[PDB]
Amino acid sequence: LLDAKASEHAARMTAMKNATDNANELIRTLTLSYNRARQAAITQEITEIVAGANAL
Amino acid sequence: GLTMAEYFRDEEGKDVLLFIDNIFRFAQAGSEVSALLGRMPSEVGYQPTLATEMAELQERITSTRRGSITSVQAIYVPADDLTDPAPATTFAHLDATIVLSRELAEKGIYPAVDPLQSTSRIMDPRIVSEEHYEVARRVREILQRYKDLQDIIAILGMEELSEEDKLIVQRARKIQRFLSQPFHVAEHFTGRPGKYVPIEDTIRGFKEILDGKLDDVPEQAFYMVGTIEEAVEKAKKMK
Amino acid sequence: TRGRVIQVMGPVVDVKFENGHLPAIYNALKIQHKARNENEVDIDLTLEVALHLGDDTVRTIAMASTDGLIRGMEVIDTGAPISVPVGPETLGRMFDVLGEPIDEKGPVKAKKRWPIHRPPPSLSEQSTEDEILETGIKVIDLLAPIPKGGKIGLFGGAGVGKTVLIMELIRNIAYEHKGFSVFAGVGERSREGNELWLEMKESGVLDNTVLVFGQMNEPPGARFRVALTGLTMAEYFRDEEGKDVLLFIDNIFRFAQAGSEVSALLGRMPSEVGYQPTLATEMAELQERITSTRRGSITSVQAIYVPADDLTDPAPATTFAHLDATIVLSRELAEKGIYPAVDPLQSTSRIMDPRIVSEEHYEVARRVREILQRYKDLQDIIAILGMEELSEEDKLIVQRARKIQRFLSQPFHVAEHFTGRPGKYVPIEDTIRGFKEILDGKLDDVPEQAFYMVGTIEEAVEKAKKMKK
Amino acid sequence: TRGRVIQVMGPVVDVKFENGHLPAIYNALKIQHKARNENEVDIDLTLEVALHLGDDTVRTIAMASTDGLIRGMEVIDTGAPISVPVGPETLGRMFDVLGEPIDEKGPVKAKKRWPIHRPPPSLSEQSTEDEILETGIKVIDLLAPIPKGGKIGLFGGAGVGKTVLIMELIRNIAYEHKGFSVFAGVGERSREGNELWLEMKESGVLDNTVLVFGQMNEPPGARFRVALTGLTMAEYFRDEEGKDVLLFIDNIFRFAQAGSEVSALLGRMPSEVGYQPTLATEMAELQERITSTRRGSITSVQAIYVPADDLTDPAPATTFAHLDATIVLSRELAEKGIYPAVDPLQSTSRIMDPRIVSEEHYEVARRVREILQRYKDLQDIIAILGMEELSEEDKLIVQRARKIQRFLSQPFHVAEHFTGRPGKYVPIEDTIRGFKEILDGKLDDVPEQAFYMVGTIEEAVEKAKKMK
Amino acid sequence: YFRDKGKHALVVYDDLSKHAVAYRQISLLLRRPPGREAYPGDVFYLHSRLLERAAKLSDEKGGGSLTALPIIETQAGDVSAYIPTNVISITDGQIYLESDLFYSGIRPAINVGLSVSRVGGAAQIKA
Amino acid sequence: SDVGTVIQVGDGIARAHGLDNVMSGELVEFANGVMGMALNLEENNVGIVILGPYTGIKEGDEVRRTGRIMEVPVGEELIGRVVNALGQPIDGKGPINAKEFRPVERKAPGVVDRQPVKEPLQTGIKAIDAMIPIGRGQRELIIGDRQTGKTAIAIDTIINQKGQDVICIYVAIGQKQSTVAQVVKTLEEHGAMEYTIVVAATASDPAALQYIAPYAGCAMGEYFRDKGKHALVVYDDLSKHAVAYRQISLLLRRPPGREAYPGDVFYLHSRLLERAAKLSDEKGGGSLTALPIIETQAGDVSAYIPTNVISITDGQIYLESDLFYSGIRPAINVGLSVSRVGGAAQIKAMKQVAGKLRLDLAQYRELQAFAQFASDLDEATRAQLERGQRMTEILKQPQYSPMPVEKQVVIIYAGTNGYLDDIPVEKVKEFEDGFLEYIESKHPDILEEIREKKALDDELEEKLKKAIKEFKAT
Amino acid sequence: YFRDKGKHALVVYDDLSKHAVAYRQISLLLRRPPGREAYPGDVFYLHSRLLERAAKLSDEKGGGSLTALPIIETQAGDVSAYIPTNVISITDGQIYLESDLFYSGIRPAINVGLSVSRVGGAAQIKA
Ligand SMILES: Nc1ncnc2c1ncn2[C@@H]1O[C@H](COP(=O)(O)OP(=O)(O)O)[C@@H](O)[C@H]1O
Ligand SMILES: [Mg+2]
């Protein structure tokens, strides 16, 4: 039982370490896609202001 | 083409099929023209008259007390964005809408129709059988539950998911590829003969997977088969 | 002198003056025309000058509907900006953006009329005697004290409790401070102006208050100038009567959106996320005139709508600069039954320093923010693992945070009809004493339910017994 | 001949001509005016023609501040573009965008001036004999070779050692190659330019170098044309003297940004992310003149600032269309105490193919990239678990990688005021022989610490005996 | 008409988004200067001059009533867009429908944790 | 002719006919008395930017040329005064009789007019002077969220300059008049106004004055540098200055770029900040140092204006909203803040102890997260943790209370050598006040030696004198 | 010329991404209003008018042929960009090359999961 507790706590620790690492790469990749989607949309709105003002 | 299809409905009283491979091109041609005419541009550079021009075409394509026009239309989606003024303006006019996903095409599942965004006016308990309505409901729900889990399966090991979620993943996996079918017009691309499936065998097929009668059959047996009996002999062709 | 209408395009009107002289910028113009024949309609309209164009011509923003206008109609120059009645006669009356009474009670008959566009107080006329304005509201008086002559902002989405919190603050000032208040309904929903007018007419608070509304259905030029009308009426009580007065502005977000619509109508290039290029200049023309001077003081409570939970939008972002204190209202607290629903972890003020408030006040407010944050750092562990796994210290820290979280809740008088709870006012000495007694662990063998909706801490102690515990 | 200022709008100035003919495009104009009364200011200014407008009028971009200009002031047409002195009398000298000397050493007195806008070499004049340029820098010479007549991109944050490496390359060419170098600075901190000038003035490199500056505080017209001034001075050494010369550009990102500001001032409609619509054309006018011919050759090292730390931005993307090689100075290497900081896994070049370089050079570079990647793929087991748990094959690979990682290091000659180390030069044959000797397992006894900052491999063997 | 005579009325606008698009078309063809998301600056006054006409009158006016149920369509869930935020600020409450709940088998598909009505409590019966 | 007539008036921008002989950048005067800049010269009109209240200006009003480029008064007469962006007095202490006027537009010093910075600028802050050194000709940025202490660090720096021959200039851009009044009174309470100049363009002033303010404050700072003296310039917020220029540019109808700011924004701030420098011994050896301040939304350092100024400056001081609310002052992030030009200018005595401080905090800042629990880590990491906590207490300092360099050396020397390793964390602040008063009241020899030698020769006296304090009064 | 005379020809376009940038430059300098990613509205007609001239003629016309191999460059693998998807909508097939697989020692590095042809299977020999 003592060896089972040591291996359980070590297994939960190592598994949750890998899970935390997986969550971070997923957060990094998602954040780059959020930034690209938002940044791509902003430069288009600026382009519409230019075209709209030149059209008068 | 529409003015020629209208004559058979109005003056001859017939039932006709009208096919259009691209109505998006009709919208872009109006966009190219608009700047030179002297008009102010709208969102993403489009013409101020976009919804009016699409309605001048789409309101004529209807069935009346004299005869009927049924129509199949293809709409190109630029840069894969459905929020674009041309595809966006078109959805209001359709009785059925089929959306095709690159994620399905890149995975080899053809025709690549997205099960969660495709819909029709006719999908009501008053217009289709109780068995059809219940099977379609259960298919859309299991695929949505599988879509809600691909993050959890990425962060934690699949051995950490509950028995219910474990079965839901295996059934959703079998269903997404049982939706695939070899077409007669695609024999050059698919390397298979081509198949035609009647509604009775579609409903019977999905019900048999949803009810778990086929849990002991590999996912690979459901890919590129027309009917359920074929999936079972495709499993036999592999010890 | 007299000019003529040249163009009409929605809320925008162009006028030509020719002989004599042209009107100044922000100057008010009048159109008074009687139908010459049955094909015309009678018109009564006021316009504000915005810019000079050449050819003895001026562009203007209409204060009411432009329907029925005709090119060649005569226009008159008043020689000054929009001018509104000022004085004690303005108390207990409802007003339009142009200072005309809305209510059927009759003409106001005031002795003087002040213009809406005047310069703010100078650096010499600024005072630095900071102190605290007691609201009687247990969350504001502890975590985000209000400076006299300072500005306090209430941030949140829809249905969190901003207007009810403003209505309770108006009551409390008329109850014990006996001061004069002004409420500016910038872009007010007509359904809400009726509920504010009825609460104040029946509770008696209306006799000491000024109501300025206009309507959310009026053109953008009216929704933009209305906050200045309430302010110009509040300035007279500070400058000519030497009093300390409170100005309430409900949703400056509507003020920002109305300047944007006017700039777009005049033809200016859109700035960040489509707002006007002049946003920071226009916000400041209103916020600067609100200050404590050597004559008296104007303090202000302001509500701000946070669109789609985004605090980075230009309207909330430009406002933060002029706020001495900040209150953020969380929808998650409102639906859990905790009112006023102020987030204890996002609310702050500049006056929260030992040199401006007592050492006991500063020390208690610090210990409160700390224990709440510690409990926030543990609610994941309390849910996934058994509460029996938490240490003795953390277990007591959780229970004290649990009593403190609800002890921040208070029943309001203006809200008695909804729940039937009588309403309470708590003095600063009892707010500090209450939280200190909970933090010091003196009052531990009392159930959490006793601290929800009670006023002072003695009332919580008797309530424990009323619940037979 | 004689124009008159008609309009003034910041850097933009409009001039009308009469009694003669109009100037050509790219042509320089001069304004020289003396205060007629105590209310006026003396002015000395140069303008460059951008386009013809009609009604005998021309639009121009000013090279210096326009404050004090008055409508109706006389303008002199020089009849040609900006002309700068050329010859060997330009070495060891500091210049402005107009070719005027900055330093108080006197007039240059050169025999000829050369226009700064000139056609590039034709397809019939090019040279397909791709060869290599020995830099003597051990990381550049093996993992990312530089071809004669090519363009190299230098990447790295503020403080990673770019100025240190630039001066080390300029010095090294002046030491054994006995060749000429040219350095151009655009949109740069005037402070950094001063720190580089003193460090070169003390290391004796200045006598073999030319300096040209356009500062971060100069108007957009000057920051736009300065890189062309260094290039026009480097061309005379190729064409009239037949030499092989090296051109350094402080930050071609400020070249790109300065063109974007001039475009926004001229009122042209912008493209994606607000850069100028002409970014690709403007980058080519500078980049195509930098080529090898049957007369001689010009090569260039250009530093790039990556905005927001993302390479997808247009300026980096339009620059990479012209580049032959990339050298990356890494922040993680800098904190580790490695001073050259060049990343062995992110640096690459077009020349690094078996059909351009020798079979032996490609084989060693391949085995080096592979052992360094293999070592990077194993440091987790070595850091999280005890080092005694690794297998024999991985352990020997780790010992070779541990020696190799620091054997790539080299003490620089320009670093004696920082660390006092003598500085080292490593020739190509000893770089190949050195890495081969460790990779083939012939020299594994020597301690790891002996390979850090030593030059050639034999110097590590004596250091191991001398350290005790 | 029904409100002015002491009776009750309900008015539904099937989509205010297509009504805004129809006004954008006329305003751009008439050359009025554009703003946010290409719409005219006048567009808030368009819907507020409409929706403020729905009211419950006083007993002196006859006690009559008119309630409104406007509808808006969002592109790919963007509630932060111009016309949606404009009309969200005018109304006394909003019902939010999710494409996610609808395919998951929660059929009316209402986001009860986001939807709100200010009149809640006062509108309902005691039971 | 010298005179013209107004033909159009908008929000602070006007157009006029005539003005034939006006020059680009000249000051022009309105009949009312307000002033404006002649920016654009066209064939038949002049575009004028108004430097005051525009509502009194109408079409047909007379406008006259002043015959001078936009200049601001400079000299010794400005010290101890509060002025607007045009130099006009706003303190009520009467007129100013400056005899010298310099343009607000000057070219910065050239490559050979400069030299590297070798002498320090003492801020009086124990976290800055030890970990983020500042030279006398450096440009350091103060950056963080609103209400985190950014002006308090700048005011603490000016108050510390009482003994040194540094003239301090404070420029308020778009600030509330109340906060401006609070700053002027704090400077008078501490006597800083005997060597300080305050320049103001408040939130109600026109956007044109908020644009001119930093250039006018820089021109006053340059007069001391041109005469061989030292000067310090503070710009209260470059974020509001960028917003003010964005307004004038959009109202002049210029096309926007990234985040709606014009492309010309980078040049607006590089042109300003490149003028602060230490001159060469041939030019006179004078100096001008700049402390710009920037506000970040929600801690986002990656935004356009923040990264634009990070590329111009020589280092940054990063402030955290979380530390400010966690009871910490000045709330500086020492693991991210650094100075590139510093360290070369720092005194020898601070270098002998700063090296230890940086190595100890590096170790603590890494393990502190993992060792969040009370005592699970081993003694080898516990020793690091307690040292880090105690050094963090030594880094704390109250508002408007600068500590002199000699006292900073002895307190930092006390922490980095382990003499505080047995003192409870709650008593470190009381120990610091008591130990410094003990050393100053009866051991002034140690402080006078550090002041004249600027290095530690023999420390033996300080070790023995400190042991005597520890045994007699904790 | 070869196709019109019954001979077979082949044409390569080294990069259509640069051809598009050149047309964007000429169109913006003529002051034509931009659309997506600042490219002109005419940009589809530009490439479709060029690529539809590649064909196999009938036996009455001579049986001649003209094959085309245009090339395009993706920023960071963004195959979904405007000009890339625009040309994919005109051609008879796509060959996609991975920068990721190329550094893993793989050549030609073609991503078969995305690469496909519309004429495929029919042109290939029976074996
Ligand atoms: N103190 C309170 N006690 C009970 N209910 C409240 C209280 N404050 C607010 N509410 C409820 O929530 C609503 C708040 O609406 P409102 O004041 O308009 O919120 P907001 O302006 O923040 O959007 C009230 O109409 C009422 O139904
Ligand atoms: Mg609300």
Author numbering:
A (entry chain G): 232 to 287
B (entry chain F): 231 to 469
C (entry chain D): 2 to 470
D (entry chain E): 2 to 468, 471
E (entry chain C), G (entry chain B): 248 to 374
F (entry chain A): 26 to 499
List sentences quoted exactly from the publication behind this structure.
The minimal subunit composition of F1, acting as the ATP‐driven motor, is α3β3γ1, with the γ subunit embedded inside a hetero‐hexameric stator ring consisting of alternating α and β subunits. F1 is the membrane‐protruding portion and rotates the inner rotor complex against the catalytic stator ring during ATP hydrolysis. Here, we used ancestral sequence reconstruction to infer the catalytic β and non‐catalytic α subunits of a putative ancestral F1‐ATPase. To reinforce the structural integrity, TF1 was used as scaffold to accommodate the functionally crucial core domains of α anc and β anc ; nucleotide‐binding domain (NDB) and C‐terminal domain (CTD) of α anc and β anc were genetically fused with the N‐terminal domain (NTD) of TF1 that forms the stable hexameric scaffold (residues α1‐94 and β1‐78 in TF1).
